[PDB]
Design a protein around this ligand. Sequence first.
Ligand SMILES: *C(=O)[C@H]([C@@H](C)O)[C@H]1CC(SCCNC=N)=C(C(=O)O)N1
Ligand SMILES: *C(=O)[C@H]([C@@H](C)O)[C@H]1CC(SCCNC=N)=C(C(=O)O)N1
Ligand SMILES: [Ca+2]
Ligand SMILES: [Ca+2]
Ligand SMILES: [Ca+2]
Ligand SMILES: [Ca+2]
Ligand SMILES: [Cl-]
Ligand SMILES: [Cl-]
Ligand SMILES: [Cl-]
Ligand SMILES: [Cl-]
Lengths: 243, 243
Amino acid sequence: KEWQENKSWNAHFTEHKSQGVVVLWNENKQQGFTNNLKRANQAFLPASTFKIPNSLIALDLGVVKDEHQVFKWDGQTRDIATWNRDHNLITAMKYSVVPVYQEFARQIGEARMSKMLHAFDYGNEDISGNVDSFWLDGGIRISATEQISFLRKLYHNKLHVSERSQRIVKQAMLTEANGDYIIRAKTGYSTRIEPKIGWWVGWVELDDNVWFFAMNMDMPTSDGLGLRQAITKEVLKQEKIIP
Amino acid sequence: KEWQENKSWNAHFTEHKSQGVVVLWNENKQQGFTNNLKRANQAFLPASTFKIPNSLIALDLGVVKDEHQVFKWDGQTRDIATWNRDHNLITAMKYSVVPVYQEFARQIGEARMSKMLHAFDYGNEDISGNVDSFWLDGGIRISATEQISFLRKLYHNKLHVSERSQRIVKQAMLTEANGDYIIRAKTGYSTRIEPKIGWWVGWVELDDNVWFFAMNMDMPTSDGLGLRQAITKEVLKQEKIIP
Ligand SMILES: *C(=O)[C@H]([C@@H](C)O)[C@H]1CC(SCCNC=N)=C(C(=O)O)N1
Ligand SMILES: *C(=O)[C@H]([C@@H](C)O)[C@H]1CC(SCCNC=N)=C(C(=O)O)N1
Ligand SMILES: [Ca+2]
Ligand SMILES: [Ca+2]
Ligand SMILES: [Ca+2]
Ligand SMILES: [Ca+2]
Ligand SMILES: [Cl-]
Ligand SMILES: [Cl-]
Ligand SMILES: [Cl-]
Ligand SMILES: [Cl-]
């Protein structure tokens, strides 16, 4: 792979008083683009973008039966109100319900979790820390370019889990669709270890091509979280990927 | 009694100077709703809504290997410009590319198409006519109520084909998604035999319920096609199913 820097994308960070990186990958052309080649390859905690590999492993191992199985609220009231109810895989992904996925990771266990992250070649393949929080405050790290590499394999059903698990997780990643494009993606927000950053990783399905993306950006307060999608979509619009 | 007539929906037809039926099914409550019980049970040619069972059968039989397989344009220039190119299952559904599906039906063949439609309990299960056009000008008939019955089976993966086939077709039915709802659906437009009608059938996925819908309306000319979705969405908004 071969990477072109487009610094003009930086205008969209500048005009929103922000700093970060957008990485794009044109699947047809096998060509990548980014505003910052160095930050594109900087590895960070994945935070809730780890729900993608966690979901795959839980499904492949049968910890999750299917996308309709109900995960009961553990009763503890937490600050994000959508978390304080029962969920299935679809809504747990949509609302990024951490406690549900911590429960998955406990059941998967360290041995199988480590084996699967090596099988996926996911980030630095390091799960040091608590098995139920290592993607929030442990040793795992992944860069935006490494998120693309992983997502490309998921798109092609080439990860070493069942085809069914990959199809279900891609259903659960559904974020936006209309007559012009489909976006499958996952947000993240890493706050437990500096630097506080926001993530958005996934892809845009067109009629005749797929554009993979991965972005992260400094997130000193939660009032900037909507800029994850906003800045990405402005880059997508600039490159004429979406209208 | 599982159906309730709500003639107030007729306002959405009349003020678009239209005649037709909208049928809704509340999956959680197992209760149905329509502006017109009699038209709701009136069977019509399925036209392009037949692409849903046709897709399922082609996938189950390996006629279609997956949603990436390319079906080459046969070089015949047809009136709908988007048909005059290569397609896969996703784009052939999106652009309702009849010639692609006519070829599927020839490969499926008469005997296998008949057995599968009986297994599906699809409409009147009658495939009299040409193997590659019976859903356009042959003997098969299906009502809006019978469309709901079939779609419910598909949603629950209870049809008599592989789980994989059903997941792929449901992916191919994706029409709209946002933070509030997901619509999986298929349009239709029956012209070859009177009465000329337009169809929209599918469902709305919410966080905690699924609403199945099937509508048809008199379609004397091609210019009222947009009201298939518009009128349905007015009924959905009235019942507060979508915001
Ligand atoms: C995943 O990264 C986080 C988890 C680490 O808490 C969840 C929570 C959020 S943002 C909710 C904060 N809003 C109000 N301050 C996300 C997210 O990625 O949006 N995932
Ligand atoms: C399926 O119902 C028809 C097929 C029988 O021709 C295709 C074509 C259309 S509408 C295109 C007409 N526009 C221009 N006048 C559809 C559809 O459902 O929208 N499917
Ligand atoms: Ca901008
Ligand atoms: Ca813990
Ligand atoms: Ca109106
Ligand atoms: Ca029957
Ligand atoms: Cl998480
Ligand atoms: Cl989907
Ligand atoms: Cl067709
Ligand atoms: Cl049933």
